[PDB]
Amino acid sequence: SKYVDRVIAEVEKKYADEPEFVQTVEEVLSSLGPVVDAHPEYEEVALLERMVIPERVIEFRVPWEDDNGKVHVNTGYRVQFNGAIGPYLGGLRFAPSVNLSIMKFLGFEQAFKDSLTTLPMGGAKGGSDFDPNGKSDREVMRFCQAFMTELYRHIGPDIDVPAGDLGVGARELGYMYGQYRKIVGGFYNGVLTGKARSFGGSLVRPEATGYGSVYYVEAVMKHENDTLVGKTVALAGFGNVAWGAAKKLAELGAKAVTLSGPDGYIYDPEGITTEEKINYMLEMRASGRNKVQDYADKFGVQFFPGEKPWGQKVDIIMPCATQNDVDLEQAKKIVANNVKYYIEVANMPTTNEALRFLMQQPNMVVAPSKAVNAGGVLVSGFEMSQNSERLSWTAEEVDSKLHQVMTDIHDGSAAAAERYGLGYNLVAGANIVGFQKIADAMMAQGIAW
Amino acid sequence: SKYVDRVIAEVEKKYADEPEFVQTVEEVLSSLGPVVDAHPEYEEVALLERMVIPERVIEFRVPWEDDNGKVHVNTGYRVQFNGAIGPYLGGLRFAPSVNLSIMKFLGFEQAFKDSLTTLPMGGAKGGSDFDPNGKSDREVMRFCQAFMTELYRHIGPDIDVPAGDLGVGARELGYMYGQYRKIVGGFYNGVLTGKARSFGGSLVRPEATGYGSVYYVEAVMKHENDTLVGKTVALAGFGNVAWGAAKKLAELGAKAVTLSGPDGYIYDPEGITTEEKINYMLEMRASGRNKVQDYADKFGVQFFPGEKPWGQKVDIIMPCATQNDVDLEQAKKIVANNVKYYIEVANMPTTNEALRFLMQQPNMVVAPSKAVNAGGVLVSGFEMSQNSERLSWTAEEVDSKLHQVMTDIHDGSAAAAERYGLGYNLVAGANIVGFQKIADAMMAQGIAW
Amino acid sequence: SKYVDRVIAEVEKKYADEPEFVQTVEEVLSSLGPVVDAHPEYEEVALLERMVIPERVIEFRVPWEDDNGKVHVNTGYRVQFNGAIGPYLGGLRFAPSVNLSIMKFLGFEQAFKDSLTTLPMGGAKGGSDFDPNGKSDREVMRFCQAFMTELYRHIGPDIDVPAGDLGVGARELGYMYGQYRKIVGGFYNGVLTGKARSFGGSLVRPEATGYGSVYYVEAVMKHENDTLVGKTVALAGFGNVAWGAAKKLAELGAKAVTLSGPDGYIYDPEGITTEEKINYMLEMRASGRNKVQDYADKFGVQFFPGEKPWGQKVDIIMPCATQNDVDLEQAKKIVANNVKYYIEVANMPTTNEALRFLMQQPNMVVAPSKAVNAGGVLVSGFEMSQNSERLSWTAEEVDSKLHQVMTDIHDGSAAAAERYGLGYNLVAGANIVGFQKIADAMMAQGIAW
Amino acid sequence: SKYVDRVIAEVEKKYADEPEFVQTVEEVLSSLGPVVDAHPEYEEVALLERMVIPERVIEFRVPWEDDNGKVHVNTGYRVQFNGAIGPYLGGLRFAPSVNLSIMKFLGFEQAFKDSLTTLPMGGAKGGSDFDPNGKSDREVMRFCQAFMTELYRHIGPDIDVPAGDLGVGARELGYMYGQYRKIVGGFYNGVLTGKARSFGGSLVRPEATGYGSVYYVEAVMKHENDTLVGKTVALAGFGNVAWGAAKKLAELGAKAVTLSGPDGYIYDPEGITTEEKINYMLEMRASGRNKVQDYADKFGVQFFPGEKPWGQKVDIIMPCATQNDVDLEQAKKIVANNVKYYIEVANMPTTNEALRFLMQQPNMVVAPSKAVNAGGVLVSGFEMSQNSERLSWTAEEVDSKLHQVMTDIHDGSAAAAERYGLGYNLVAGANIVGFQKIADAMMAQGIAW
């Protein structure tokens, strides 16, 4: 699309200093070529030019005192990218690398992911360059309070609902919510998601991402007249998402055989399929040791230090941990192993070279993270619904809706790709389904945003 | 009722310059005689005197620029008549004839209609003397933005929820909502109803009015130990309501045999009962040609120019289009044809002379529009519920509730009429059921409003 | 001006049912012909078409209980006509005749009067058809509370500042303010003017109108190389404005020789120039007897029952009481007496026939009320300034500013009339000066309002 | 100061991509060394680290339609840098070069300038990459409305008061204010400064900057036991500031002899000291021709194309136009001419190399722009005071306060420099006086911001 090509060129030039953002825009816009070409009306209202600019960006100062009385200063961000279809929504990330470029990229992607869920949720991302590592509980609390003391004025249950991300878990959410309720003088607990149950959190929230990624894979087996049962899976991390996946895989007849750590990776040809095995992952996570070895020590299974599990022969690869985990180097090993299923779970766990490469492979199935990991945002939307109804749903209710929607995200993505003649391209399909709803909404709302 | 008679006399005199409003009050209050007489307490708190005065009236200036850069000025209205039982609710009408008199009349009636639904909905009406005919899409957009830039401050999801009416459809709602969200800085999509699905609209909303009018007729057959099946129906228009009715009639064993236009009317003894036939109506509507002839041309069926279909012999008459469509002249032809069922669907499609006349006829069944067309406001209440829960209901869910409530509106109306000894007077029955809930609510709330 | 002529024709037709409003627009717009013709740019932005439509109109229900427990229902109004140059400002009128037509007319005129003061004050008018006659203090209080319980949400110190008018004096202002502060939970006493001193009222407020009308007449003598001293004046009423005028006239070397009542009028060739004489007027006002006779009884001066003092030969005529007091019948007597000075003080105390007539008279000086009575709104602006500074000015300060501005209003009016070649036409001059500031402000603010 | 040195090093590294901002911080912080060293307590509360981070940054999307119906998208900014001593305050700049770096730099400097005025004014800056060149009046209006539709929620008379800057003059302010009042539903005219008189603008506002820069120079003559009279001045531009300066210089016994344009510069050994001469500048400005030649054509004075007037021998140099106008190349010519007075008027009209150079010159007097051009922000504070009092001050009042404060800014700056042993260093002196008030305020307010 000449139109699409022009917008990418303008972005590349204007936001040169925001490499992460530029790359994401190109990657996403480049798959919409066919859709845009079918809708000349978009260009007439500068639809794409509007979409690439967040509705609202807020950055603010965050001074806070440590346990020693020393004063520190960090910077807070909230990028409210697109709210055409619901209140803005997206996690908060606390990591020393956070800057505007990164917030925009995660926030642009969030809008597309949120649109796929089929729930009314806009897209946003925020956080701070604050580093929670080595801070006391009390220091994290004071930071969260100082952070919320400015943020509260920009968010709210019908405005912008933040959630957890790297560096922000239940604990940080609890502290931020405590400050919020005190300043605003009311409950409004739907202002954040990822809450503890005692004050409005949803059942299945910890399992959401991992389970949802398996319900998606299941929809893939079905499409391919295949089956999870018997299937072996290579996982990354031993974290929340890894834990949730292993668990549902096990329950489903499949088994993970690997886990990974910054220290290396383990192989467990038996499968991390036991209550004992599975629960221990929570142990390791708890420990705060940060060693995947502990699992091999404990179970007496192979531990290959400083090594990625991407070399093992398995039926399904699911990177559940870090960005750019799979590089060309890892993709080639994956390819050489004749794995048909490549399923991104963690956010951007594959470099673009690696991605194109895997996508060029005619026999493979490559699923993008924005669709596969949608189960977590899906449970965040269910928590907001529960908080608005002022009641709790049962775990069977949440899990059953989770399951039906994950299947729909896969199926709709395939259908969309197919319709624009792209074949079974789950990557473009996700982008397209996500884009269409947003475009419909913006076209109907006129030129205001 | 001397009390009722006195209030009507005061209205007639004070609002002499608002003929439309005066007539509506008389017509409605005059049927409550029996109820009021049973509740002396009403008069002690000047219940009727309060009811006839809207809680709040807002009129405002609306300057806007056309595509040529010329500046135009129209007037905006919102009459918030009664909010005893829910947020005010009612459509917006854009037509050069709009003035306060007309807003008050539609708004007084809206309060009674909304009360019948059994949902928590107050009554209001608004609009502008702006004429959307001959305006570009862009001109309508700029007008909607200018209109909302003042209106937003008077409405809100828990305050006043506007909806479509003459001159205001999905397109205008979309543009007004776009401006609203931008000014308020949040989502709050329950602020308007009749929205597109992409941003919160409900399934069955387009079909709501027409379908609901048929579920009501069905409750009438049942009362009269009769049946829809086999029944033939004379419709008016080829619009949304006509389309929805034909459709559900067909599905139900009945058939419409007429349609109408400003150009005349058509007769199709076969019935507009085919997918082809039915869907074409949407075609004609789309065309923007405004000719019922196109249907006869297309299907090769009779077209009688400049003629109302009220002369054809059918089992059921359903005027689905314009006010004062049926006059004495048309009622006599209807009477002479021995039609037992007279069912108003469009708003005030019968003149009062014609109405009294039909009502004097001992063998007929006359149903008032405020009850029969309640399916549209009913779906607006379901959309508000869905937006508050932050989810969508399925089409089966909406349709099933629609159906049960429409039956209840008929049944409750008959029961009420019967209890005050009025026989099967669906017209007074609607007024009475509507009035009672409102009165209960106002009596309990005291003298504040 | 063809443009001016067209707008008047459109008004006449659209607001046919609002005779009072139509007449005022014609009278005002017709004098701007020359100014409009000098500014073609006005028509390009539909300046006049916008001006004739109030920015915002609010009407609301007002139920209240009397001392006997009976419930009454009145209607409340606030027409916020033009706020281009300041918060809306204008009195509240409680009289059974009040309707929208009358509010619009007084409110359109208010905008022009407020603009002349040179202070930042927009124009508005409001009130109720509530009749304070025969009500107890307690009944007036309950009404004022019920009235404010809705009004508070539409006004505020930086939004709309109401003041007294017919039927609304210090007492009503006090009660409305009491309810306002209680609902809003703060002080904000600049929300109303005409307050008692104990809670923010300004010194000279009772004298403001009457005194200001004399400082204006003084500027007229100066223009005409004449003098107040020796001058005799015919007044109307024995009220606040009459009292203030007599007082300042006396102090200035002049003397009033008449007063009037619904019962007739008195002649006091000595002059109502004594402390005794002057103060008694307050007595009569207090009495609540409503008889100008009491003054003649008391002083043994002529009392001509059922007669207007417009037949007495005096140097200056100042109608200080009621609308359309001076008709053609009275103008002819005035003319026949060779009075050169005709100075409207009360609001619209002259019919239009009478007005044109007096204006056709080559030797006379006719001053319009909107300029002459501006001293009262001027003191309302000074009260708002004092309340914003949170202090009180001395009486010398208020009186001295009052005086300088009244002179300026006369002088600017003459200068303006002169510049458009109209001669010493104080009537058109007022309209023109008032219009120009408003037009400047609207042109600079764009097409929003 | 090791502390100061450390903060600069951190800034340089963290904001590498914001060169303009980095340079400004270094330049300002490096002169505070002596003050910081005297207050160890600052470092204990991370005072400098907090100061270099704006309290709040807002960026937002700005879609707007041109006269042809085409849709454009720009980006809006508001950097609310420091509000310790008053509502944030600072101009809006519309220029295609605008980005966050530039907003931060102008906004950091604004905080120091505003602090010097002695009025309660914080510091901020905002704008858009929108280019007003070649736009119609109507296009600028639509942009201003779209811009304000988001901005209004972040500003307000007690929060953030924007003012004009490059690309934003009375016209843009008028349009933005029009939209603001319409959305907020009240007056609050103190929300912006630089307004037209009709709606609250202050007398002397157009003359403020230029006049104030001359009252400062006068305080310099006094310090140096010298005199303006007889003095000759080289100006840059023929704009507002140049016009105001020439005017007051003339009146004071001095004379400008040069003016400049993008086309070259003119020399008028007589002096641009005549009503005719002076007023023509307004002519040239009006013309929109953008040619300083027109002055030479008109007066028959020398015009040296493509040349800066920095080579002429005069007593005083006052660059009143563009950034980095004076480079090393121009400073050397200035130096070689033995000019003692170097007075920056325009914002950053000298490069840093040039600055250091001039500052190394033992016989010269170099005055920084942040102090010299403070007269414009000073009149903005007086306009806010007038709008809060709801009255206007006379021109003599504004001018007299302007004058006394400008003298004080010079005198306090010298006194401060002197106290920290820096001699007559007006550049460091400005920084120091500005910094001290801000530091006092932040130390007293604690660690919140």
PDB file of C-alpha atoms in Angstrom, chain C residues 292-397:
ATOM      1  CA  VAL C 292     -48.105  58.170  47.384  1.00  0.00           C
ATOM      2  CA  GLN C 293     -50.907  60.057  49.118  1.00  0.00           C
ATOM      3  CA  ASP C 294     -49.323  59.510  52.544  1.00  0.00           C
ATOM      4  CA  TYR C 295     -46.644  61.960  51.454  1.00  0.00           C
ATOM      5  CA  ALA C 296     -49.163  64.682  50.639  1.00  0.00           C
ATOM      6  CA  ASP C 297     -51.191  63.901  53.770  1.00  0.00           C
ATOM      7  CA  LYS C 298     -48.002  64.141  55.845  1.00  0.00           C
ATOM      8  CA  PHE C 299     -46.670  67.242  54.146  1.00  0.00           C
ATOM      9  CA  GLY C 300     -49.946  68.849  53.104  1.00  0.00           C
ATOM     10  CA  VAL C 301     -49.042  68.985  49.411  1.00  0.00           C
ATOM     11  CA  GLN C 302     -51.286  68.419  46.377  1.00  0.00           C
ATOM     12  CA  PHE C 303     -52.443  64.924  45.599  1.00  0.00           C
ATOM     13  CA  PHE C 304     -54.068  64.282  42.256  1.00  0.00           C
ATOM     14  CA  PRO C 305     -55.571  60.758  42.410  1.00  0.00           C
ATOM     15  CA  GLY C 306     -55.417  58.392  39.424  1.00  0.00           C
ATOM     16  CA  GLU C 307     -53.151  60.828  37.598  1.00  0.00           C
ATOM     17  CA  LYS C 308     -49.637  60.678  36.139  1.00  0.00           C
ATOM     18  CA  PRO C 309     -47.308  63.544  37.014  1.00  0.00           C
ATOM     19  CA  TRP C 310     -46.318  63.825  33.294  1.00  0.00           C
ATOM     20  CA  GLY C 311     -48.491  66.977  32.952  1.00  0.00           C
ATOM     21  CA  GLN C 312     -46.502  69.168  35.333  1.00  0.00           C
ATOM     22  CA  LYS C 313     -44.132  71.701  33.909  1.00  0.00           C
ATOM     23  CA  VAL C 314     -40.571  70.851  35.004  1.00  0.00           C
ATOM     24  CA  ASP C 315     -37.100  71.069  33.541  1.00  0.00           C
ATOM     25  CA  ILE C 316     -36.424  67.322  33.628  1.00  0.00           C
ATOM     26  CA  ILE C 317     -38.599  64.258  33.414  1.00  0.00           C
ATOM     27  CA  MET C 318     -37.240  60.996  35.047  1.00  0.00           C
ATOM     28  CA  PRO C 319     -39.602  58.029  35.033  1.00  0.00           C
ATOM     29  CA  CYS C 320     -38.285  55.819  37.834  1.00  0.00           C
ATOM     30  CA  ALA C 321     -40.963  53.263  38.192  1.00  0.00           C
ATOM     31  CA  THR C 322     -42.834  51.185  35.674  1.00  0.00           C
ATOM     32  CA  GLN C 323     -42.719  49.994  32.168  1.00  0.00           C
ATOM     33  CA  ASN C 324     -44.797  51.816  29.591  1.00  0.00           C
ATOM     34  CA  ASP C 325     -45.607  54.497  32.178  1.00  0.00           C
ATOM     35  CA  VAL C 326     -45.181  57.201  29.497  1.00  0.00           C
ATOM     36  CA  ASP C 327     -47.492  56.591  26.504  1.00  0.00           C
ATOM     37  CA  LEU C 328     -48.161  58.806  23.462  1.00  0.00           C
ATOM     38  CA  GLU C 329     -50.810  60.516  25.560  1.00  0.00           C
ATOM     39  CA  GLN C 330     -48.185  61.425  28.157  1.00  0.00           C
ATOM     40  CA  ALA C 331     -45.457  62.255  25.646  1.00  0.00           C
ATOM     41  CA  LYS C 332     -47.734  64.859  23.981  1.00  0.00           C
ATOM     42  CA  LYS C 333     -48.335  66.553  27.313  1.00  0.00           C
ATOM     43  CA  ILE C 334     -44.629  66.456  27.965  1.00  0.00           C
ATOM     44  CA  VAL C 335     -43.977  67.902  24.478  1.00  0.00           C
ATOM     45  CA  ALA C 336     -46.647  70.588  24.838  1.00  0.00           C
ATOM     46  CA  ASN C 337     -44.854  71.627  28.041  1.00  0.00           C
ATOM     47  CA  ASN C 338     -41.584  72.256  26.247  1.00  0.00           C
ATOM     48  CA  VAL C 339     -39.475  70.049  28.471  1.00  0.00           C
ATOM     49  CA  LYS C 340     -36.106  69.528  26.826  1.00  0.00           C
ATOM     50  CA  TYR C 341     -34.878  66.671  29.026  1.00  0.00           C
ATOM     51  CA  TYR C 342     -36.447  63.249  28.797  1.00  0.00           C
ATOM     52  CA  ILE C 343     -34.382  60.750  30.917  1.00  0.00           C
ATOM     53  CA  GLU C 344     -35.556  57.129  31.252  1.00  0.00           C
ATOM     54  CA  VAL C 345     -34.477  55.652  34.521  1.00  0.00           C
ATOM     55  CA  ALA C 346     -36.798  52.772  35.259  1.00  0.00           C
ATOM     56  CA  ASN C 347     -36.614  49.889  32.727  1.00  0.00           C
ATOM     57  CA  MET C 348     -38.635  50.502  29.510  1.00  0.00           C
ATOM     58  CA  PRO C 349     -40.858  53.205  31.109  1.00  0.00           C
ATOM     59  CA  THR C 350     -41.825  54.514  27.649  1.00  0.00           C
ATOM     60  CA  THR C 351     -43.833  52.813  24.902  1.00  0.00           C
ATOM     61  CA  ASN C 352     -42.291  52.785  21.485  1.00  0.00           C
ATOM     62  CA  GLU C 353     -44.826  55.077  19.926  1.00  0.00           C
ATOM     63  CA  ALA C 354     -44.079  57.519  22.672  1.00  0.00           C
ATOM     64  CA  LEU C 355     -40.347  56.976  22.211  1.00  0.00           C
ATOM     65  CA  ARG C 356     -40.230  57.651  18.432  1.00  0.00           C
ATOM     66  CA  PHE C 357     -42.394  60.652  18.983  1.00  0.00           C
ATOM     67  CA  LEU C 358     -40.074  62.191  21.609  1.00  0.00           C
ATOM     68  CA  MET C 359     -37.114  61.324  19.411  1.00  0.00           C
ATOM     69  CA  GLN C 360     -38.617  63.146  16.457  1.00  0.00           C
ATOM     70  CA  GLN C 361     -38.663  66.327  18.578  1.00  0.00           C
ATOM     71  CA  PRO C 362     -35.746  68.433  17.492  1.00  0.00           C
ATOM     72  CA  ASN C 363     -35.217  70.325  20.638  1.00  0.00           C
ATOM     73  CA  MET C 364     -35.222  67.469  23.169  1.00  0.00           C
ATOM     74  CA  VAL C 365     -32.676  65.246  24.779  1.00  0.00           C
ATOM     75  CA  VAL C 366     -33.814  61.680  25.242  1.00  0.00           C
ATOM     76  CA  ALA C 367     -31.600  59.264  27.256  1.00  0.00           C
ATOM     77  CA  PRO C 368     -32.256  55.456  27.173  1.00  0.00           C
ATOM     78  CA  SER C 369     -32.679  53.500  30.359  1.00  0.00           C
ATOM     79  CA  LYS C 370     -30.025  50.889  29.543  1.00  0.00           C
ATOM     80  CA  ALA C 371     -27.379  53.607  29.897  1.00  0.00           C
ATOM     81  CA  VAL C 372     -28.981  55.770  32.566  1.00  0.00           C
ATOM     82  CA  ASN C 373     -29.708  53.055  35.022  1.00  0.00           C
ATOM     83  CA  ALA C 374     -26.323  51.342  34.642  1.00  0.00           C
ATOM     84  CA  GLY C 375     -25.239  52.493  38.199  1.00  0.00           C
ATOM     85  CA  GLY C 376     -26.925  49.586  39.792  1.00  0.00           C
ATOM     86  CA  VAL C 377     -25.121  46.963  37.656  1.00  0.00           C
ATOM     87  CA  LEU C 378     -21.961  49.012  38.150  1.00  0.00           C
ATOM     88  CA  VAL C 379     -22.189  48.597  41.973  1.00  0.00           C
ATOM     89  CA  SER C 380     -22.921  44.885  41.449  1.00  0.00           C
ATOM     90  CA  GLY C 381     -19.556  44.640  39.548  1.00  0.00           C
ATOM     91  CA  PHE C 382     -17.790  46.556  42.384  1.00  0.00           C
ATOM     92  CA  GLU C 383     -19.365  44.128  44.941  1.00  0.00           C
ATOM     93  CA  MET C 384     -17.980  41.171  42.894  1.00  0.00           C
ATOM     94  CA  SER C 385     -14.543  42.868  42.884  1.00  0.00           C
ATOM     95  CA  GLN C 386     -14.717  43.405  46.659  1.00  0.00           C
ATOM     96  CA  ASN C 387     -15.763  39.866  47.259  1.00  0.00           C
ATOM     97  CA  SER C 388     -12.858  38.589  45.040  1.00  0.00           C
ATOM     98  CA  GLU C 389     -10.341  40.780  46.915  1.00  0.00           C
ATOM     99  CA  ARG C 390     -11.910  39.608  50.184  1.00  0.00           C
ATOM    100  CA  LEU C 391     -12.253  43.155  51.576  1.00  0.00           C
ATOM    101  CA  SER C 392     -14.617  46.145  51.531  1.00  0.00           C
ATOM    102  CA  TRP C 393     -14.035  49.461  49.792  1.00  0.00           C
ATOM    103  CA  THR C 394     -15.087  52.649  51.496  1.00  0.00           C
ATOM    104  CA  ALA C 395     -18.239  54.518  50.413  1.00  0.00           C
ATOM    105  CA  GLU C 396     -16.128  57.357  48.968  1.00  0.00           C
ATOM    106  CA  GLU C 397     -14.260  54.840  46.784  1.00  0.00           C
TER     107      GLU C 397
END
